[PDB]
Design a protein around this ligand. Structure first.
Ligand SMILES: O=C(O)CC[C@H](O)C(=O)O
Ligand SMILES: [Mn+2]
Lengths: 430, 18
């Protein structure tokens, strides 16, 4: 409906306020900034004049693509809420836009503060509670997020947005069966914010984990709806266009000198890893992304997000020195370089990595003769000591360990070879 | 919490505006 943005005094200056807003809507942003700055000087308590100043700064940040200008707008949106006699609709618009722009800039804790204030000021607005839940999720506070969506559901139990987010939270807590009805019903609601790749991804995954054969129906519909490159390649942080295939040869990747270095020096890489196992085993950390059905699996990470772990590299100094010659891996801010040890009785659930922007090399270091294998998409392969396998882990893949002794590999992520130097310099780290 | 091998976090990147 027609939002009511003018308090009693602002209606008496609606002519001036309209003129300034007209300048802004016509794109004359600098003229509009000056007009609203004059109105704010003249009517320092006017919320609509203050809101105009903020909206003008916001439009200006967009035109200049300037984070600095947008931080100015963020403080002016707060100023609006600081004034006397702010109409409720205007108060809510100003603080909502504040939170949205804080999130855009990455100020997740500041956005959370604004969202908490919004819910205090408007306790019957369920949408604002849903937005608060997102604020919590964005700072990693799943406990409070869960409580928010529980409150929402206890008032509006058919709220689809709250259903899919509650289901996401449940699935992340390994409450797999319980998450399925929430994710499914929320997607099916078609409510705004439910048509999101994350929810198709995790609904399918939970179904696969419980043996429900409908999982690929949801993967099909997520592909059809544009969230997945295909039903098998379900990464969600993608550069569209990159060559997509589950398995690559060294020459197909162009990183032939890296592969040669890994294979020719494999015993050195092996031996440093074994020494860490023997004398510094705490550098191997258990896998902690809920990817195991059962078994023991740990990793010893030398690089992550394109940053060298200096303490870790003390444990594998020659390996780190060897790898420094290859920026295609050491500067791959969407991958890692790590030793991975897997013991008998391990099954890694089918899963996908987050991004199509990397390829993953595996160098075999200690490979039992029998029992170890990795499937990617429909092809299944085995490791060999001193040999590299390469696969695109944005494709669904699965791992088994049923030997009688441990299996050690070395994992080296590289940028997808078709990514340009500016792409490799600019993409946000994962 | 980071997305290393999987896709389990609500978001896997940190944004910084424009
Ligand atoms: O088999 C391992 O140790 C690693 C499997 C993991 O899912 C990967 O993507 O490399
Ligand atoms: Mn994996």
């Amino acid at each position: 409906k027609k939002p009511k943005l003018l308090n009693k005094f602002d209606k008496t200056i609606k002519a001036e306020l309209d003129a300034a807003e007209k300048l802004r809507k016509r794109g004359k942003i600098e003229e509009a900034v000056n007009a609203f700055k004059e109105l704010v000087r003249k009517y320092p308590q006017s919320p609509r004049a203050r809101y105009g100043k903020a909206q003008c700064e916001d439009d200006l940040a967009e035109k200049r693509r300037s984070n600095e200008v947008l931080r100015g707008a963020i403080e002016t949106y707060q100023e609006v809420a600081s004034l006397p006699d702010v109409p409720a609709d205007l108060l809510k618009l100003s603080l909502k836009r504040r939170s949205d722009r804080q999130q855009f800039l990455g100020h997740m804790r500041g956005s959370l503060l604004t969202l908490q204030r919004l819910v205090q000021l408007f306790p019957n607005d369920t949408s604002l509670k849903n937005d608060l839940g997102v604020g919590y999720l964005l700072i990693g506070d799943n406990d409070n997020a869960k409580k928010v969506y529980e409150e929402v559901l206890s008032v509006t139990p058919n709220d689809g947005f709250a259903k899919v987010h509650y289901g996401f939270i449940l699935k992340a807590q390994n409450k797999i069966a319980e998450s399925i009805p929430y994710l499914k019903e929320g997607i099916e609601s078609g409510d705004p914010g439910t048509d999101d790749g994350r929810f198709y991804f995790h609904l399918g995954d939970a179904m696969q984990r419980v043996g429900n054969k409908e999982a690929y129906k949801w993967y099909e519909l997520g592909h059809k709806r544009g969230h997945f490159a295909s039903v098998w390649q379900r990464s969600l942080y993608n550069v569209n266009g990159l060559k997509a295939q589950p398995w690559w040869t060294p020459k197909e990747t162009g990183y032939t000198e890296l592969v040669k270095s890994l294979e020719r020096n494999w015993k050195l890489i092996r031996d440093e890893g074994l020494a860490v196992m023997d004398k510094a085993k705490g550098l191997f950390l258990p896998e902690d992304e809920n990817l195991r059905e059962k078994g023991d699996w740990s990793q010893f990470t030398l690089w992550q997000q394109g940053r060298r772990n200096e303490n870790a590299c003390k444990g594998a100094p020659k390996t780190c020195t060897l790898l420094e010659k290859f920026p295609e891996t050491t500067g791959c801010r969407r991958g890692q370089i790590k030793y991975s040890i897997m013991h008998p009785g391990t099954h890694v659930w089918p899963h996908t990595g987050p991004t199509n922007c990397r390829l993953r090399m595996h160098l075999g270091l200690v490979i039992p003769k029998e029992g170890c294998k990795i499937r990617c998409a429909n092809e299944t392969k085995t490791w060999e000591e001193g040999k590299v396998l390469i696969f695109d882990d944005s494709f669904e893949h699965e791992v088994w360990q049923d030997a009688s002794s441990f299996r050690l590999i070395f994992i080296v992520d590289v940028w997808h070879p078709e990514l340009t130097p500016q792409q490799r310099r600019s993409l946000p780290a994962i | 919490g980071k997305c290393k091998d999987g896709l389990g976090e609500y978001t896997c990147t940190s944004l910084e505006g424009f």
